[PDB]
Structure formats: structure tokens, C-alpha cells
Design a binder for this molecule. Sequence first.
Ligand SMILES: *Cc1c(COP(=O)(O)O)cnc(C)c1O
Ligand SMILES: *Cc1c(COP(=O)(O)O)cnc(C)c1O
Lengths: 400, 403
Amino acid sequence: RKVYMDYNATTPLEPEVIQAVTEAMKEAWGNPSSSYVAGRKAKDIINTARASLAKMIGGKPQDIIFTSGGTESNNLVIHSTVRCFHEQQTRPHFITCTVEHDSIRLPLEHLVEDQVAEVTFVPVSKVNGQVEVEDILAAVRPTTCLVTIMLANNETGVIMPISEISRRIKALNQIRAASGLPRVLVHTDAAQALGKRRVDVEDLGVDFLTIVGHKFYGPRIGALYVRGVGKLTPLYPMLFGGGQERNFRPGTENTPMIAGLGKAADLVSENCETYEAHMRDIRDYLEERLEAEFGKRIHLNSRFPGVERLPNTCNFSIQGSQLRGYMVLAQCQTLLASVGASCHSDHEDRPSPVLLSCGIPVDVARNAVRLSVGRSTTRAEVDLIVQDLKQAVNQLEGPV
Amino acid sequence: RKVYMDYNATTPLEPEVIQAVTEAMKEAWGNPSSSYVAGRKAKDIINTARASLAKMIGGKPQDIIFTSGGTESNNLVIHSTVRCFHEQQTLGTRPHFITCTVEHDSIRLPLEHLVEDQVAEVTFVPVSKVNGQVEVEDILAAVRPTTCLVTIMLANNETGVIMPISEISRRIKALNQIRAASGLPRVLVHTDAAQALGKRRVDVEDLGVDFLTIVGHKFYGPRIGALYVRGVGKLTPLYPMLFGGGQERNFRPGTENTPMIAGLGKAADLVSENCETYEAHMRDIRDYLEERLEAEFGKRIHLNSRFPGVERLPNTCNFSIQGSQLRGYMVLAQCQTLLASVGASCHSDHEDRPSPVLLSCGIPVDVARNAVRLSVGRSTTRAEVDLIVQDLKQAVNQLEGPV
Ligand SMILES: *Cc1c(COP(=O)(O)O)cnc(C)c1O
Ligand SMILES: *Cc1c(COP(=O)(O)O)cnc(C)c1O
């Protein structure tokens, strides 16, 4: 009955993923560290999954480190960077943008509050909702250690120019090296891109990349890509313990979850283009129907000029004092969506800081609703929720 | 055809746990923070599991914080303590910790790290080489004006020896009244109860601790964990290691792993419902096991889990058979049925190095080098014991026979 359009918040598990998790729970329950066959069996599942993730993003198995999820992966990159700077050695400097996920913004703000590091939160262009390359390069100081920019924004869907950033940073690094300055590394939070658009680390040129399983129909765990970890790129751990994950992330491996993530990654490798095309077809049809139904009263908050965006995201607002996002969704009987990051669902009456950062007017941001379609969404489901929205609007704003 | 006796390394999942996880994956996949029924349904599964864990250890739901496993839980309490120390002062200087010499890597290493980085000072109290237990008097004797945390494992994973946590907590509570009188900050107590859950009753009111680590895969649950914090936000502070979405009341952000939490809650219910049965059964099997080992090997056997005057886990039997050729890993390499280990899995890459824990417990190097750790479980039978004992006899004879 309901129509789910909140895939950016989380995705359901593919049946093959569920199957993998289940078989691992039953068949490969042994401690992966144990010498006997049962332990070696779990280890192989883990090795296979590491290769799956590596293949998904075009990196190598040795560049993948499993973590409990996106939040851990993001905090890890930031924590490692601070340690690296102190080992190389005044505080480390970070460069990021104003629309990152809480797992990037907050750990950085925390470092600032504690006076451990200095951070330049580069405002995104209020024109295209994208961080601009020149603003990032201009922010680099002798103490700059890491540039962390999300590949795609979870609320707007806007793609950031990661590949250009890495390229410009590489160029600037050649000068720093000759000058005796350490290199500025680059990390990208790719949580919302995986499974929606091709993600290749060689194309992106990044040194770190965050992988989030529950964004691409996988389990609630994740990983962190680190270009030639320990050799080409340094990684200092947050956790200390039994030596798992080459001591970069100790703790008995969660084989079942890893198995699920691996299978999830395989499906992306094999079908990413199919998913992307279907999402784009559905999202475009969705925007077409919303425009036909609401005309001049609707504003498409995800259609910025000159920039790319996820194929599945359509953040929009309908003009009207009575059409606050959370009020509209409350009146919907079929549509399941959100007004922004799930992480902020306890204050839905407040305009999204992210949309405001993107130049979206306050009253437009207050009425914003984020629709994010998925692999299974159909045109018939789009029609259903457009009609659901029509009734919700007519009830709140009334006829115009 | 194999007989598993390495439950202290990890345990298989109970059928019900597996079902709980599978059900959650299929029916409760929504984001717990979402403003619609799908999200509300996952949150309820999480709340139920929180209550389940609380009941298992005699605490309250509000005092349970889910984590990714034992390692995270242990690192978290140590991190939080460092933060707390400085915060209280702010309201150059280093916090002091007290632990013992036989803690798991997830307690020992984070503490060594702080010492190396000059972030804190730590007193690694040596356990008794007589009873392999850390003594209450030695811990209290190590207390300094700057001591803020005493962390002692409830049960050792290699020997099975039970540490006097309730008495440690009692003596610290009395000391804190004296410290408060002079205006000094209080000393908190944490216990790594990884190896005790599901094997013996664990009651936070009995133990008197402020923090307690819970490890799912040690009691037939999923590979995640939790941290008990006594009246968190009211009687005990907890400073987060991770920052982000506000989940777990911001003590541990990150979209909740509902299926794993579902499994953990179910594993906890089983312990709550059947702990006495599990314990009594393990004790019977383990005691029968030692009887048979002594019967078959006689005076050649050394029982390394039989220290005088102390309690021990009901399922553990660490032992050694004398002989230059009977190194633990060598013996196990010859076994065709028995599945065990020579120490914490975490150190399997160097099974040829005598256990530092056994050595710290007074076990002579000749005995320590030949140690094998047998840890039985809920399903282990006396028949299976007889099998591995014959498997050991066979193995021993091969090792000592013509080259
Ligand atoms: C989902 C997401 C994350 C990770 O969040 P978790 O709660 O740990 O799953 C990080 N960044 C972005 C942009 C995301 O959408
Ligand atoms: C298993 C165990 C832990 C936790 O270890 P993980 O590898 O994170 O599951 C902590 N302490 C002790 C004594 C343990 O046996």
C-alpha cells in the first residue's frame, strides 16, 4: 500500500544480501582468527567480501578496511589525520564544505571547540549548491592535512567535483614536497553515490573514501578505502585491541555483516548502470508529474545549474504558508519520505541548514520534502504519491 | 565429526538468535530515526533489546548503550575516562588508571597507548602468581590522588579465574567517601565481563560497578556488543568517541544495526531465562573433562585452571601435558577431532610463544609452553569429552613416537 521514497535515508536489504548474511550466521560462525578449518572458512568469506568492495570502487583488496558503518569510517579518517600530523611534527588544518553529513561536520566542529585543530568549512556556492574547487584550493595552509568533501549530498543529491579537487590538490602537492611540506590528503564521503553512480577511486583520485552499506541495499556496516594503506597512505587507528583488520580496526570480525556487505557490493559492480538508469527514469518522470500537477507553485530544489546530481533524488517545495514539509508528509496516506537527514527528524519544523547553505530561501526550505526513489520504484508508484500529495496540499493550503 | 571446545574464542548462534536477526532484516529494515511507522517499528525492536540486555545484568534499559562489540566498549570506557578527568578539572595533568596484568588486548593496549603518548599514567597490577587473581589489597594500594578508573576483567579468558569485582567495588566505594571528604575526585570502576555472561550470574548491583562491557559472540549472540553505564547522565558521565547523527543519545551515533541488536537482545533473553542451566551443565562437563584427563595422562598432566581459594568459570579447563614435544599448538595440530586453542585467538599468529597470561599467573614456562585451552559449551556432552580425550592420547603418542 505505502510507497517508499526515502532510499537516501536507508534502503531495504536485497534478498541475496539477506541470504548471504543468513548462511554466514549458520555456516561460518567460527572466529576468523582461529587456526582450525571453521575459522579459516569465515576468513575466506571476509577475504571474498574485501575483494567485492575493492572491485565495486575500482581499488584493490588491501585498500579496504571494514568498519561498523559510515559514521565510524568518517570519524576514523578525521582521527587518523590528527594523529598523522602529530607524528609528522601549531595544529592540523582541515578543509571541508558546509553541507557534509553530521559524521563529518560534528567531529570537525568538536576538534575546533577543543582547540585540537583548525577547520575551514568552505561554504558551497549559493548558485549551484556545489562547493567550488577554487575556494578549496585557496583555503590550503602550510598546516593543511586533509580535504574532506562529500561526493554527493544526501539532501539535494548534488555531486561535488571530487576528481578535479584531487587533481588540483595533487598539483599543489608537487610544490609543497619540493618545499619540504607534507602532502595534503583527500577524502570523500561517498555514502550516497554507491549504487547510484559509478564510483572509481582512480577517477576520483582520492586517498580515502567512505563506504556505507545501508545506502546500497547492504547491512548496517561499512568500510573505509585507503589508497595503499600503510604504504602510500598513512592510517592511525582509533581502536586498540586484538589486531584484526591489520590492527587498523581491531575486534572480532562480524562475518555475517561482512558477507552481506560483500554481496551488496557485487550487485553494484554487476548492475550499477541498470540501477542508475532506472532511478533517473523514475525521478525524471516524478519531476515531470509534480510540475504538471502543481505548476508554478512548485520549486525543484535539486535542479541546480551546471551541476550533476544523483539520478534518484528530488528535493522539492510547494509554495504556501500551510505547506511546511513535515506537515505535508503527515497528511500523506501512502507516500513515505522525509524533509532532510533522518538524523534531524526531531526538529522538522526548522529549515534544513543544508538547503539554507545552498541558497534556498527560508520559506522554500521550510516546505522542502526530500523524495529519493529506488531500484524497484515504478511510474505507477509515482502517480500514486503525486495524487497523495495533491490531496495533502488541498487539505492544508486549500484551493488556489 | 569435530568436537568444538573453543567457546571462549567465540560461540555459534542459538537458533532463536539467528531467527531474530533474519526476521529483523526482512521486517524491520527502516531507519530507526524516521518519522513513519517503518522507522517506529525498528526502534521498538531496539528498545526491547535494550530492556533485554538490562534484565540480563540486573540493570535498567536507560543504562545500556549499544556498540559494535567488546573492543569498542572497552576502548570507549577508557576514552570517556580521560575526557571526564579533564572536564572535571576545567570546571599538563594526567589521569591515572588501575588494571591488572592479564586483561584482554582491548583493555591492555588502549591503556599502553595512553602511557606511550603520555596522555595518562597506568598501574598494571600484577595478579597473584599463587592464585592467578588480582588481589583487592594490591588494587587499593595502587590508588593515587589522580586515579579515576579501576578496570578489572570479571573473568580471565585463558584461565577462567574470576576476579573479586564485587569486593573491589565495595572497597572503592568506601574509599570514595574518604576522597569526597577531602574534596578529591571519585574513582569509578569498570569490569570487562565478556567471558562471564551466559556462564555465571552477572548482577551490576552485586558487582557494584559503574561500567560493564557486554560481548555478544561470547554468549551465542551476534558480533556486536554494549556498554552498561550506571545511571548515565545522572550518576555516571559518558563522553563519546564518535560524533554524528545523535543515535544512542549521542553516546554512540550511527544508524542503528537493527538486525544485530535484535539478535543480541534474543541472546540476552536466553541468558536471563537459562543462565543457571548453562552454568550447571558446563560445570558438569568441565569437571568430568578434568577427571578423564587426569585418568588418561596421570601425573603427566598439569591443570592450569585450578588455582587455590578462587572461583573460576564453569566451562574452562586450561591444561598442559609434560614433554618437550607437547607444545600446545603441536598437540592440537595432531588432533583430528578436537577444536580448541592455546590462548586468546587474538594471538594465534604466534602460538609458539608461551602465553604471557599464564606466565603472569605463576605457571612455569615449561608448563605454559604446553598449555591448551579447552572451553566447553551449552551442547557439550560427556561422550564428546571422551572422544577428545582419546584424540589427545592419539596426538600425544604421535608427537613422542619415532620421527
Ligand atoms: C548515511 C550517510 C553517512 C553515514 O551514516 P550512518 O548513520 O553511519 O549510516 C555518512 N554520510 C552521508 C552523506 C550519508 O548519507
Ligand atoms: C572476547 C573478549 C573481549 C572482546 O573482544 P572482541 O574481539 O571485540 O569480540 C574483551 N575482553 C575479553 C576478556 C574477551 O574474552
